[PDB]
């Protein structure tokens, strides 16, 4: 019995399912989860001293690799001055200025504790700004588990998708198909006067990685313009990763509000929301809209260091090039083994699919892929020293620490895994 | 033009109101906020290098004082392994076991990113467990700014209290007066079959410090038992501070769920919810209820929190905090009396409240609102002049730390004597 199996057994007594984060229980891939105790560069180390090339990166933040020495040094130096205060700091001013200089759509920005809180605040601001109650989201997108997002389409605009959520809290949420601009236009033509905002992951990352179809994001911008709707980009995963200026820069579409995740905290817990000044000015204390969440200096220090380091010229081109080499090598080995396989990519974000589709465009494409084969592939890849996302429905992430040695390990593991399928 | 004034002016361009946390803008006390750059023990240092005796303690977490060397050392050693070295960790098991051993009502516990998300999860679990939709909260209590809590009483149970919140999201939230057990019993007699939970700060901390009236928490427990309602204690501020086992231990009332934060990350952002096993086991992945605020225990918060929780378990820790706090409040009262300034205080362990009021005691939210809030604002700035940093709001509890000793008491009392002399 391994150290991870022992910890997992012991964890069950006081932690539901043995995990604080549900996906970590391996229910989406089978087996018992690995416990980790160390990470460095492109690698994570489990409690049984096995080292894996990491393609989760704590779900996005670790674009510099784990334990980048400049980031760690910045946190170490900040530690001397205290873990937190109850009051404003110069670091928070530096961070707000830097983020708004890097992402032009951000004219003002707020730091909060999480992406979930950032979503709550952004939608509430959109509702306050427009005087409208309803929102549009897309099936397969994730913006946090707040009650009015725990909903599916109504056959009332929405109905709860899980227990503990009152029906009334779902009635203002419309759920439309990702990458279906005509459905957006039709819905806004019918009830657009009621819709405060459209929220979207510009690259979906929580139904595996699904990039936007041609014209989709541009169509959302135009439809929102025409109907007076606030366009919200959820860049918790895509921010500073698909490109320096995020998916909005990469695809050239400017939202009214954006949410950002732990990358701006260099890996430490944090979230942010920001965007057009006229909308942001409604937030307390100068405006009447309450904020969900009430700037940790370690996260600010880590994030400032991280954002400066990834501003090096060519950073995302290098990251993109590694990712393409990896996906190319995977496709080559899947083709050689006769395994239907297709990939998606947006910068340092990728998706792997056991599917015969020519391209993954819709939620239906995702759900139609061979999930059971992915589960087997995941465990075969663990055997080869590679740690993919433990779910067929989660995007993967590369880091600047991934180099020739990690690519060789990854491709050799995949060759053996494909042979065993 | 001080460094803090320059920073506040520069912060306005890209941060709304110049602050990330609205109360930090000093709108509740007037003037412009102090920016801080260092803290140690009982002291905070502003950007102009003035030191203040601190009674905010980062709003609760710093019960050991700021920058406790053993806590900092634990974070430094944990740093050697990465900011987030992944998936479940042994530290998270160690934390869950320690919390449930220290707070016996917690049979299972989850760590999340904030107290706001802990509340969202705990209320959702209560709704799922009971099959009921409505909640009871108390006027003046704060559990996070989620939509269904941004509500006031209806004259439909609740209505939104601020813009951007649909009316439908307020209809299931009932608002009752804190410390009024008879109003709770009347409400449950009328609509109890609709009420999934009562959520309460067992000591109110977000309308200044208002301890529970005799029989109030016991009455909530009896009424919840009678009506099949889940009792939720919000111990984000009271937890590990009113007593080692929280306000639930101090007052001897056991809730069905509790929320925690602040002290359990040692100063780092984190929140938690936990309680009865039958309720908690509904949470994903084994049960059907979705969790708000998933972020597997970030290791620096787990290391800082484990070290903190062990240090505050030292024998007599909270007795020492209480004893300091009583000397301080007695000395403030003496000096206000000497100056002919109406004044009353509240205390619960390492939490306290200062009130410019002629009331014999502060029991209700109306008591808090009736007090002389403008005098508090003047008092706050006079205390800053004397090197003391109180909570910058007449509606926020104050906090003492184990680092507060004779020197800090002397500074605090001498500052207050000068401040009371300037108030009239």
| 8 Å CB contact between B257 and B125 | yes
Residue contact A86–B290, C-beta within 8 A? no
Q: Which two tokens stand for residue B204?
A: 């109110």
Q: What are the contacts of B325-329 at 24+ separation with CB within 8 A? A: B325/B349, B325/B350, B325/B352, B325/B400, B327/B409, B328/B352, B328/B400, B328/B404, B328/B409, B328/B412, B328/B413, B329/B354
User: Reduced to 3 states, what is the DSSP secondary structure of residue B257?
Assistant: strand
User: Reduced to 3 states, what is the DSSP secondary structure of residue B125?
Assistant: helix
CA distance between the termini of chain B: 29
How many whole angstroms from its chain centre is CA B249?
16
Specify the CATH class of A1-68+313-421 in words: alpha beta
Pairing of strands B257-261, B271-275: antiparallel
| 8 Å CB contact between B254 and B217 | no
Cβ neighbours of A96 in B, within 8 Å: 11, 14-15
- DSSP single-letter state for residue B237: T
Which residues does A317 contact at the CB level (< 8 Å), separation at least 6? none
Reading across the β-sheet that carries A36-40, which strands appear in turn? A36-40, A43-46, A51-54, A386-387
* A129 min Cα distance to partner chain B (Å): 8
Q: Closest Cα partner for B10 from A41, A375, A94?
A: A94
CA distance B393 to B414: 21
Q: Closest Cα partner for A264 from A89, A36, A99, A49?
A: A99
Residue contact A22–B284, C-beta within 8 A? yes
CA distance B248 to A110: 35
User: Reduced to 3 states, what is the DSSP secondary structure of residue B173?
Assistant: strand
| 8 Å CB contact between A160 and B128 | no
Any alpha helices (H) in B237-287, and if so which ranges? 246-251, 277-280
Which residues does A405 contact at the CB level (< 8 Å), separation at least 6? none
Give the dihedral of Cα atoms B305, B311, B315, B317; nearest 10 deg. -80
| 8 Å CB contact between B293 and B120 | yes
Domains of chain A by residue range: 1-68+313-421, 69-312
CA distance between the termini of chain A: 27
Compare CB distances from B296 to A24, A44, A108 and report the shortest one's residue: A24
Residue with tokens 């320690």: B98
Tell me how crowded residue B153 is: count the other CB atoms within 10 A of its CB.
Answer: 15
- DSSP single-letter state for residue A234: E
Compare CB distances from B88 to A24, A129, A267 and report the shortest one's residue: A24
Question: Which helix (H) or strand (E) segment is A89 a member of?
Answer: none
**Nearest chain A Cα to B65, which residue?**
A82
Tell me how crowded residue A407 is: count the other CB atoms within 10 A of its CB.
Answer: 17
Task: Report the residue of B48, B62, B93, B103 to disrupt the A interface, i.e. the one with the largest count of A CBs within 10 Å.
Answer: B93
State which fold the B1-68+315-424 domain adopts: 3.90.1150
Q: Closest Cα partner for B267 from A270, A84, A89, A79?
A: A84
> What is the Cα Rg of chain B in Å?
21
CA distance A81 to A117: 27
Instruction: Give the DSSP letter string of B43-61.
Output: EEEETT--EEEESSGGGTT
Cβ neighbours of A80 in B, within 8 Å: 67, 72
Q: Helix B90-102 and helix A3-11: axis angle, to 10°?
A: 30
Compare CB distances from A22 to B126, B280, B285 and report the shortest one's residue: B285
Residue with tokens 């003391």: B388
| 8 Å CB contact between B259 and B144 | no
Residue contact B286–A16, C-beta within 8 A? yes
Instruction: Give the DSSP letter string of A301-337.
Output: HHHHHHHHHTTSTTHHHHHHHHHHHHHHHHHHHHHHH
Which residues does A234 contact at the CB level (< 8 Å), separation at least 6? A115, A119, A141, A143, A199, A200, A201, A202, A258, A259
Catalytic residues of B: 142, 234, 262
Pairing of strands B158-160, B257-261: unpaired
Q: Is the dihedral of CA A123, A126, A127, A132 positive or negative?
A: negative
Cβ neighbours of B132 in A, within 8 Å: none
Q: Which two tokens stand for residue A5?
A: 């199996």
Report residue B273: phi and psi, to 5°: -140, 145
* B298 min Cα distance to partner chain A (Å): 7
Q: What angle do CA A259, A263, A269 make, to 5 degrees?
A: 85
CA distance B117 to B110: 11
Q: Closest Cα partner for B99 from B286, B315, B305?
A: B305
The CATH number, out of the four listed (2.40.50.320, 1.10.10.10, 3.40.640.10, 3.40.50.1820), of the domain defined by the range A69-312 = 3.40.640.10
Task: Give me the total of CB pairs closer than 8 Å, taking one residue from chain A and one from chain B.
Answer: 374
Pairing of strands B271-275, B108-112: antiparallel
The CATH number, out of the four listed (3.40.50.1260, 2.60.120.260, 3.40.640.10, 3.40.50.10070), of the domain defined by the range B69-314 = 3.40.640.10
Residue contact B109–A27, C-beta within 8 A? no
Q: Closest Cα partner for B308 from B270, B348, B363?
A: B270
Give the dihedral of Cα atoms B107, B112, B117, B123; nearest 10 deg. -20
- DSSP single-letter state for residue A284: T
Compare CB distances from A163 to B57, B289, B296 and report the shortest one's residue: B289
Tell me how crowded residue B354 is: count the other CB atoms within 10 A of its CB.
Answer: 28
- Report the half-sphere exposure of A286 (CA within 13 A, side-chain side): 15
| 8 Å CB contact between A113 and A269 | yes
Residue with tokens 């069905």: B256
B256-290 in b/e form (b: 16+ CB < 10 A) is bbbbbbbbbbbbbbbbbbbbbeebbbbbbbbbebb
């Amino acid at each position: 019995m391994s150290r991870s199996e022992t910890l997992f057994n012991n964890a069950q007594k006081h932690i539901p399912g043995g995990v604080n984060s549900p996906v970590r229980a391996f229910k989406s891939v089978g087996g018992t989860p690995l416990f980790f105790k160390h990470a460095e560069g492109a690698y994570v180390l489990d409690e049984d001293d096995k080292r894996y090339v990491d393609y989760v990166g704590s779900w996005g933040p670790m674009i510099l690799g784990h334990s980048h020495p400049d980031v760690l040094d910045a946190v170490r130096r900040q530690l001397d001055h205290g873990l937190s205060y109850g009051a404003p700091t110069a670091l928070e001013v530096e961070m707000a200025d830097l983020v708004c200089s890097m992402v032009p759509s951000m004219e003002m920005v707020r730091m909060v504790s999480s992406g979930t809180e950032a979503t709550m605040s952004a939608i509430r601001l959109a509702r306050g700004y427009t005087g409208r109650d309803s929102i549009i989201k897309f099936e397969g997108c994730y913006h946090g588990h707040s009650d009015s997002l725990l909903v599916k389409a109504g056959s009332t605009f929405g109905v709860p998708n899980s227990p503990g959520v009152p029906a009334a809290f779902a009635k203002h949420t419309l759920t439309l198909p990702f990458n279906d601009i005509e459905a957006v236009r039709k819905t806004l033509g019918e009830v657009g006067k009621e819709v405060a905002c459209i929220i979207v992951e510009p690259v979906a990352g929580n139904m595996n990685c699904v990039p936007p179809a041609p014209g989709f994001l541009e169509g959302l911008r135009e439809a929102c313009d025409e109907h007076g709707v606030v366009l919200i980009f959820d860049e918790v995963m895509t921010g500073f990763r698909v490109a320096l200026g995020g998916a909005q820069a990469y695809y050239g579409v400017t939202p009214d509000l954006s949410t950002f995740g732990k990358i701006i905290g260099g890996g430490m817990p944090v979230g942010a929301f920001g965007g057009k000044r006229e909308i942001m000015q409604q937030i307390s204390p100068l405006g009447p809209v309450y904020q969900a969440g009430t700037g940790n200096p370690l996260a600010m220090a880590a994030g400032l260091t991280t954002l400066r380091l990834i501003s090096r010229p060519g950073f995302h081109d290098e990251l993109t090039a590694y990712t393409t080499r990896m996906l190319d090598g995977l496709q080559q080995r899947a083709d050689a083994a006769g395994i239907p396989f297709v990939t998606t990519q947006a910068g340092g974000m990728f998706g792997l699919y056991f599917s015969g589709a020519d391209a993954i465009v819709t939620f239906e494409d995702v759900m139609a892929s061979d999930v059971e084969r992915f589960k087997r592939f995941f465990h075969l890849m663990l055997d080869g020293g590679v740690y993919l996302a433990p779910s067929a429905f989660e995007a993967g992430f590369t880091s600047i620490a991934h180099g020739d040695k990690e690519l060789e390990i990854t491709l050799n593991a995949a060759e053996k895994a494909f042979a065993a399928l």
